[PDB]
RNA sequence: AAAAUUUUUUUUUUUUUUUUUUUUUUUUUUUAAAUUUUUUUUUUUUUUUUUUUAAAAAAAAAAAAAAAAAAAAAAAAAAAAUUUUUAAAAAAAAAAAAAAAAAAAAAAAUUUUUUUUUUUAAAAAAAAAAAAAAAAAAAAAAAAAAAAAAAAAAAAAAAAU
């Protein structure tokens, strides 16, 4: 049934109904206990993070996918959110993303370092530095984070 | 601002694959189909004549069969308001594989239609190969998942203020 669900999700995404596709996938997981393949989750995460869908509240659904996808045993996607944060991501959504991935208030230092590097590589030193205001001291006083903010300076 | 990390193990999902099995598709081998008239030329039979080589051909006559050239008629088509010309109508669209173009989303992830080419109009037996499905696993893992573990602080239970 997983291949059929994958084809159904692709058909709904191709018919401009990604918002309905997320609701259908959530209803099928909660009610009928489907276990979709990783490619379906990849397609849903990639399609929900487009510019028009994300501005209409799609980012909350794409963020809530990660606990649901984590429940089945899948690894959480890190790559597709970087492209969204490099263009129009906000710090309030960034801290929610960095806290919704795991339960111990943050992942390891490498994920936050990758977020800072991705938001620095697109000449955005405002929200990238303001996101450092919302994290505790062990990231703020870490030598690697201060080094990364000292290399890709706005100068 | 204050107070209220170290090692190792793997699980997903990978990255290729190793082997085995099944199915679809394809290739290979053998197998079901059958108009008339005049002139000229060709072939089987009979006898005679001549020539040639170690056994054949050619010349003449007769009998029988077929094809081509010319004429007439029949049939079919086009032009003008009579003339010319000579194996027949075509079940075909869908499906299958590959390539290109178009539009609308991403722009270099995962959809569509159109156009072009090939095939299907194909059945029994035999054999292998590509794709899909199922399984164990042979090697590299970020982050998630844990344990021991530099933790520390608060509470509870048990042994020797």
Task: Report helical residue fraction.
Answer: 55-70%
* Quantity of strands, as a count: 0
State the end-to-end distance.
Answer: 54 Å
Largest sheet: none
Helix-strand topology string: HHHHHHHHHH
Residue share in β-strands: under 5%
Q: Which structural category do the helix and sheet elements fall into?
A: mainly alpha
Please compute the radius of gyration using only Cα atoms.
17 Å
> Which of globular, elongated, flat, extended, rod-shaped describes the shape?
elongated
Number of helices, where a helix is a run of at least 4 consecutive DSSP H or I residues: 10
Break the fold down into its secondary structure elements and pairings.
Blueprint lengths: L1 H13 L3 H15 L5 H11 L2 H21 L7 H7 L5 H10 L8 H12 L4 H6 L6 H4 L2 H9 L4
Helix pairs in contact: 1-2, 1-3, 3-4, 4-6, 7-10
The chain binds one RNA strand of 161 nucleotides through helix 1, helix 3, helix 4 and helix 7.
Question: How would you describe this protein?
Answer:
This is Small ribosomal subunit protein mS81 (rPPR8). The protein has 155 residues and is mostly helical. Helices cover 70% and strands 0% of the residues. It has 10 helices and no strands. The chain has helices at 2-14, 18-32, 38-48, 51-71, 79-85, 91-100, 109-120, 125-130, 137-140, 143-151. Helix 3 runs antiparallel to helix 4 and helix 7 (109-120) packs parallel to helix 10. The chain is elongated and about 50 Å long.
Brief summary of the model shown:
This protein is mainly α and 155 residues long.
């Amino acid at each position: 049934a997983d291949y059929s669900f994958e084809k159904l999700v692709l058909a709904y995404c191709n018919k401009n109904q990604v918002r309905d596709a997320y609701k259908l996938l959530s209803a099928q997981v909660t009610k009928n206990q489907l276990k979709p393949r990783h490619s379906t989750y990849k397609s849903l995460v990639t399609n929900l993070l487009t510019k028009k869908i994300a501005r209409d509240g799609g980012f909350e659904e794409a963020l809530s996918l990660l606990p649901i996808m984590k429940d089945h045993g899948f690894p959480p996607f890190i790559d597709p959110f970087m492209s969204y944060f490099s263009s129009t991501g906000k710090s309030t959504e960034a801290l929610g993303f960095l806290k919704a991935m795991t339960s111990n208030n943050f992942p390891y230092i490498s994920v936050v370092l990758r977020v800072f590097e991705t938001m620095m590589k697109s000449a955005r030193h405002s929200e990238a530095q303001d996101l450092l205001s919302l994290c505790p001291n062990y990231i703020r006083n870490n030598p690697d984070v201060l080094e990364l903010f000292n290399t890709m300076k706005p100068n």
